[PDB]
Amino acid sequence: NKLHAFIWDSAVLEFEASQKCDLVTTGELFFRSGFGIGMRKDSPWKQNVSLSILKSHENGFMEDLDKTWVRYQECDSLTFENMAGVFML
Amino acid sequence: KPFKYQGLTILVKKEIPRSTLDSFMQPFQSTLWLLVGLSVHVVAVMLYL
Amino acid sequence: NVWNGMIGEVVYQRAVMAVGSLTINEERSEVVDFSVPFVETGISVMVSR
Numbered sequence: 443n444k445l446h447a448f449i450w451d452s453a454v455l456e457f458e459a460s461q462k463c464d465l466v467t468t469g470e471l472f473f474r475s476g477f478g479i480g481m482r483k484d485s486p487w488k489q490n491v492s493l494s495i496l497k498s499h500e501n502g503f504m505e506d507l508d509k510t511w512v513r514y515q516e517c518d519s520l521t522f523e524n525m526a527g528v529f530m531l
Numbered sequence: 532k533p534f535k536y537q538g539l540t541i542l543v544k545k546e547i548p549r550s551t552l553d554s555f556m557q558p559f560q561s562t563l564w565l566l567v568g569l570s571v572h573v574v575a576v577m578l579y580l
Numbered sequence: 581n582v583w584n585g586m587i588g589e590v591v592y593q594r595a596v597m598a599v600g601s602l603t604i605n606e607e608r609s610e611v612v613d614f615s616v617p618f619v620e621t622g623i624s625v626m627v628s629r
């Protein structure tokens with residue numbers, strides 16, 4: 443409770459909310475973009491890198507990566523403390 | 532080409548609701564304790580009268 | 581080994597650009613040249629409620 447709101451990428455904050463019970467996102471994604479493998483303007487690797495990334499997206503390799511590293515939830519989410527008053531009475 | 536499509540969003544504290552000792556006593560204030568005591572005792576004694 | 585559609589027209593120099601609901605994959609990206617995507621899409625499954 444030192445910062446009221448943190449503005450950041452959807453993936454990171456969604457992962458943190460999945461891991462941390464006390465942290466939650468709000469949704470309504472804005473400024474949609476994509477993480478990319480940036481490199482120098484004149485580099486022969488780029489043409490093949492794009493094709494390799496698209497090929498990896500084509501099959502289930504990227505889905506497997508999402509399953510292994512990103513897509514796993516620990517905690518997502520009346521109670522005893524709510525009726526604690528009548529028990530106190 | 533992007534390898535993960537995502538946007539910008541907001542992270543905040545969950546702030547689980549807090550339930551306290553007087554969760555049954557919000558509807559009426561503390562003055563109503565004395566008010567109901569007076570309205571019950573005075574009625575009872577005058578019925579006995 | 582013959583392309584038809586917007587990809588076919590672009591391959592044979594009959595159209596400089598192909599603007600529309602074009603899905604990016606490996607074969608199209610290796611036969612012609614694409615740009616940065618402007619909207620997210622992909623394979624999806626939809627059923628009656």
Ligand SMILES: *[C@@H]1O[C@H](CO)[C@@H](O[C@@H]2O[C@H](CO)[C@@H](O)[C@H](O)[C@H]2NC(C)=O)[C@H](O)[C@H]1NC(C)=O
Pocket residue numbers: 486487488490
């Ligand atoms: C991108 O991939 C292509 C496909 O393999 C590479 O082209 C080959 O390059 C090797 C070495 O230069 C040649 O021996 C082959 O004959 C080429 N094959 C074809 C079909 O062109 C290309 O070199 C790769 N580019 C980079 C930067 O790695």
